[PDB]
C-alpha cells in the first residue's frame, strides 16, 4: 500500500526526478498536522464498538425488513456477519486516515465488495446507509472539542468524510 509520503515518491520516481521545493513543503505540512491525525485515529478507534453497535441499531430500526424472518440479517449467523462487515469497513477507514491515502481501503477492502454483496444477495444500498451512520458518529467523536488542545482540525474532517463516502459509494 501507499501512505501520503510514498505516494509522492512513487510519482517522482515514475518521472525520474528529485523532489521539488513545493513538494518538500507540502510534505512538511502533513508532518505538522500529524498530531491532529493521530488524535482522530485514536478517538475513533477508542469508540469502535459503540460506533458500530449504534449504527446497527439505527439501521435495523429504520429498515426492519432486514431482520424479519427471511431478511438478509435474520438468524444470528447473518446478523454476526453483518456486524463484522461494519467493523471491517470502519477498520479499513481508520487505516486510510492514518496513512493519509485511501489505497489501503480500496485495495484490501472496497475492491470487489459490490460484486461480493450481489452474489450473496446482500442489499448494498442498506450497507451504504450503515456506513453513512458510522461516518456521522465517527466525525462527531473525532472532532469533539472537549478534552483536547483547541485548534482548527476541520480540513482533516473533510478528508475523513471522503473515505466514508468512498466506501459507501463502492457498495451502493
Amino acid at each position: 500500500m501507499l501512505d501520503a509520503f510514498a505516494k509522492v515518491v512513487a510519482q517522482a520516481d515514475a518521472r525520474g526526478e528529485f523532489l521539488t521545493n513545493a513538494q518538500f513543503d507540502a510534505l512538511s505540512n502533513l508532518v505538522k498536522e500529524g498530531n491532529k491525525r493521530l488524535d482522530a485515529v485514536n478517538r475513533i478507534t477508542s469508540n469502535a464498538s459503540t460506533i458500530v453497535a449504534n449504527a446497527a441499531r439505527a439501521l435495523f430500526a429504520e429498515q426492519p425488513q432486514l431482520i424479519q424472518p427471511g431478511g438478509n440479517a435474520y438468524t444470528n449467523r447473518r446478523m454476526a456477519a453483518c456486524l463484522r462487515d461494519m467493523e471491517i469497513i470502519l477498520r479499513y477507514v481508520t487505516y486510510a486516515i492514518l496513512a493519509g491515502d485511501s489505497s489501503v481501503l480500496d485495495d484490501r477492502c472496497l475492491n470487489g465488495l459490490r460484486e461480493t454483496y450481489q452474489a450473496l444477495g446482500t442489499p448494498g444500498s442498506s450497507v451504504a446507509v450503515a456506513i453513512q451512520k458510522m461516518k456521522d458518529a465517527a466525525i462527531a467523536i473525532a472532532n469533539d472539542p472537549n478534552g483536547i488542545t483547541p485548534g482548527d482540525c476541520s480540513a482533516l474532517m473533510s478528508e475523513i468524510a471522503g473515505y466514508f463516502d468512498r466506501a459507501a459509494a463502492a457498495v451502493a
Binding site: 500500500m1 501507499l2 501512505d3 509520503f5 510514498a6 509522492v8 515518491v9 512513487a10 517522482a12 520516481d13 525520474g16 526526478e17 528529485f18 523532489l19 518538500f24 510534505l27 512538511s28 508532518v31 500529524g34 493521530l38 485515529v41 485514536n42 478507534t45 469502535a48 477498520r91 481508520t94 487505516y95 492514518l98 496513512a99 489501503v104 484490501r108
Partner: protein, 162 residues
C-alpha cells in the same frame, strides 16, 4: 512500500485488529524524526549535481581501469560515462526518497530488488557503486541527526551491495 506507516498498518491488518497505541507511537516517532530526514533530503537534492559529478570521478580514480578498458560495461566511452553518471544519480535519488518516506521501501522496491541479477548479467562491479556511495557519505556536508539519517540509508545501500 515499506514505511513506518505501512508497517504499522500491515501489522494491524495481519492481526485483523484496529490500530493500537503501540502502532500510533511508532508513527509519532516517524513524524518527529521527519525534521532531520527532510533536512537531509533537501540538502542532498540541492547539491545533487556536484555530489554525482564528484562521486563519479572518485570511482574513476579508485578504479582507473574503468576509464581505459574496452567493453560496454566500462566507462571508457562517452556512453559508458553517461551510463555511469546516470546510475549514480539513481542511487542518490533513491536515498532522498528513503529520507522523505522514512524507510527503505523506495530503495528496496526500485533498486535493491534484482540488484545482484543486474550487476551479474551486465558485468557491473558492486565495488564501483560502493565507492560512489562512500564519496557521497563523506561529502554530503550534513551534521547532527541529519547526517545520521543520510548515513543510515547510504550504509543500507552499501550493505545491500556487499
Amino acid at each position: 512500500m515499506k514505511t513506518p506507516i505501512t508497517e504499522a498498518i500491515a501489522a494491524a491488518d495481519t492481526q485483523g485488529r484496529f490500530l493500537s497505541n503501540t502502532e500510533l507511537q511508532a508513527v509519532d516517532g516517524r513524524f518527529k524524526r521527519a525534521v532531520a530526514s527532510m533536512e537531509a533530503a533537501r540538502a542532498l537534492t540541492n547539491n545533487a549535481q556536484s555530489l554525482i559529478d564528484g562521486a563519479a570521478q572518485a570511482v574513476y580514480q579508485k578504479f582507473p581501469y574503468t576509464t581505459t578498458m574496452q567493453g560496454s560495461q566500462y566507462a571508457s566511452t562517452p556512453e559508458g560515462k553517461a551510463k555511469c553518471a546516470r546510475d549514480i544519480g539513481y542511487y542518490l535519488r533513491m536515498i532522498t526518497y528513503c529520507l522523505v518516506a522514512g524507510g527503505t521501501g523506495p530503495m528496496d522496491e526500485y533498486l535493491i530488488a534484482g540488484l545482484s541479477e543486474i550487476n551479474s548479467t551486465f558485468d557491473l562491479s558492486p565495488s564501483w557503486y560502493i565507492e560512489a556511495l562512500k564519496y557521497i557519505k563523506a561529502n554530503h556536508g550534513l551534521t547532527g541527526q541529519a547526517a545520521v539519517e543520510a548515513n543510515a540509508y547510504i550504509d543500507y545501500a552499501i550493505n545491500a551491495l556487499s
